[PDB]
Amino acid sequence: YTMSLGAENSVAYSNNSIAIPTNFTISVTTEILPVSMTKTSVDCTMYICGDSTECSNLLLQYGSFCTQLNRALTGIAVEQDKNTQEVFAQVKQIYKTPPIKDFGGFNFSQILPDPSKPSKRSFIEDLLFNKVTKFNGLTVLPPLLTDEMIAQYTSALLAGTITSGWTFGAGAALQIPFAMQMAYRFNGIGVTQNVLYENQKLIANQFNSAIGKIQDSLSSTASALGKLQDVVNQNAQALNTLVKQLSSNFGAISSVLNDILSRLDPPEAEVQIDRLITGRLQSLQTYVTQQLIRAAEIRASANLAATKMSECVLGQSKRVDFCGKGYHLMSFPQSAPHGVVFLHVTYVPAQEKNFTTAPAICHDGKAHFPREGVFVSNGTHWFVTQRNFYEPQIITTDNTFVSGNCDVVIGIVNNTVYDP
Amino acid sequence: SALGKLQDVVNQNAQALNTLVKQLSSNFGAISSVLNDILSRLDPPEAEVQIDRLITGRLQSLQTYVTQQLIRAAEIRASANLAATKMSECVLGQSKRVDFCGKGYHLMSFPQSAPHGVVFLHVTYVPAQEKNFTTAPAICHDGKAHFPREGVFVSNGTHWFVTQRNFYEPQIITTDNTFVSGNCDVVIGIVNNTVYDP
């Protein structure tokens, strides 16, 4: 069939009709981002020839390709280390959560680590690590920061976030209750703090329900972490191809260097050795080029992940669709194998309701424009409410400002302002 | 070791050039690296094969050099795009992105010319000398809850004041910096206080 671009919809657009939401919902999303790869090391001589003095002497006539490839692999390893370094190691002091989890009703026990396990990882981190699933010159180097250290870094970031908001990124960590932190987060997008101070229970229940839904999804679906598994599979296929490229003859008698050396004298086997060396060197150069391209891609991804960390966890960004889809409130980092997982808590308005609007009101000849809000009407009476939450207020002189006359504005309606 | 990145780039370019000019001393399986000596000694038929092998080796070396240079140029292009974005967002304005133009509240930046690069002087605002205080979400005076417009209700032990969020400036609680929306028993943590009316 032909793919559908989406459901059809026709917005009821007019010149005196506005839609103001009367409710909202908390939506916690999930964004997977690759950070680093498996630091591999390919011994050039051992891979090309392999414990062969004559073949090594023949390979030495090609220049410094061995040193070039070794330097490239070392640079790739150092880059994969510095990527996760700059991504996770961003906080100076390691913070911890207080024993009294008095967070105003929010339940973070599912994202905070528990001491009833060797590795201090949370339930989400355990799910993420459980879902993601010597040689002939091939050896893998272990990363500098272990999984336990990455989990400790994520726990310190989470504790600093919960305890400070965004002050732990600029200067020093400042204590602040999570209720007032969420009030500041709401004030940072256009919603007043009274909405939170009145619906804290509903917001905490919605957050707990979203966390539970995320847990259920991560426990049910195994294809959640896609890009990490794709990178792992690409690295595995590259390694398997590099290994299988040793069973090829490349025009020689056989692919076994020791068998060639035992069957033919050096003067006659020099040609076969040269063919094998050229073939394996071309294959290794192609592998190194592809690995450099993939390392550049992973570096770009790690830079993006570090930027998202600094702009969502250590502060509330105003960039649209950056810290998740919707009005960004806060974000929680989660460790993942060779990657990072963010939990973008967004603000999504719901229960839309259409009303009648007007640009201004003309009370006594002079026009009155609202300072912060929009003039709405429920059919007979006019009120001034917020932009993202329907809160009708009586139109007074403290909610509007006068600027000129009302004979230049097109669409102004007549109303009676109130003087307190 | 202040300008480390520029020095590393220069050293990488120098090492690439040195490797490119040293790859000519290898025979790649031929008689020798010098072409004139081969042309003088060997007969034309074998000299053709020797020249073909030398050309293949040098072309492979040059292609590897060009590939590495293209990767390095892509990295330099990414760095230059980042630097141009930082310039346009912090030198020609004031950015609100955290940890993008310095550790702290960004104020202004001053660009400086550097060899094959640029240096920014990120002037940031960093608070210091904090002090513990007791806070409250709202206060009730005559049965109606009072929420601060821009500020935080802090108390030194006996009296409540409203101060800024980044600089302790205690001010008396008046009706000009607070807005009333609702009642007392709608928020958990509200503390009874007195609101002044000028």
Place this chain on the structure above:
Amino acid sequence: LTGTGVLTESNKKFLPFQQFGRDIADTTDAVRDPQTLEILDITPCSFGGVSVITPGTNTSNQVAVLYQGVNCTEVNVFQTRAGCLIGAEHVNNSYECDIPIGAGICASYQTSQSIIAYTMSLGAENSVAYSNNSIAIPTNFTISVTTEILPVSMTKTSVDCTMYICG
């Protein structure tokens, strides 16, 4: 079938018609004795990499060696997850990372001057006194101008293929 390796005893079952053996990567890992009927598993010879952890020459000349992927039995000594570090002592205290080694292991030249090995510390421990009625408002500030190096370009070169290859 020639080669070098450690001929040990295997626990696999060779079929009566099978003589040689192979692995998943098209490599011979087990054979059958010509004289007797025993199964000899061909494990590869001991090998690895060599890394030299050395401080600046202005400080001292004492160096250490790190053999990658060894059990300190095929080559004062200490077993890490990245290999054996022969030349440094493993202390029980945690310091800041100075010379990266691998799997959280770091090295630094400390005073009795000698190279040591320890587990890197992620940072100074801190515990903010969080409470539902406690806030910390700063009373002062300090302007701190920072620097940031960013490359913008590099040297523009051009190599003529003709003059390079065929001079």
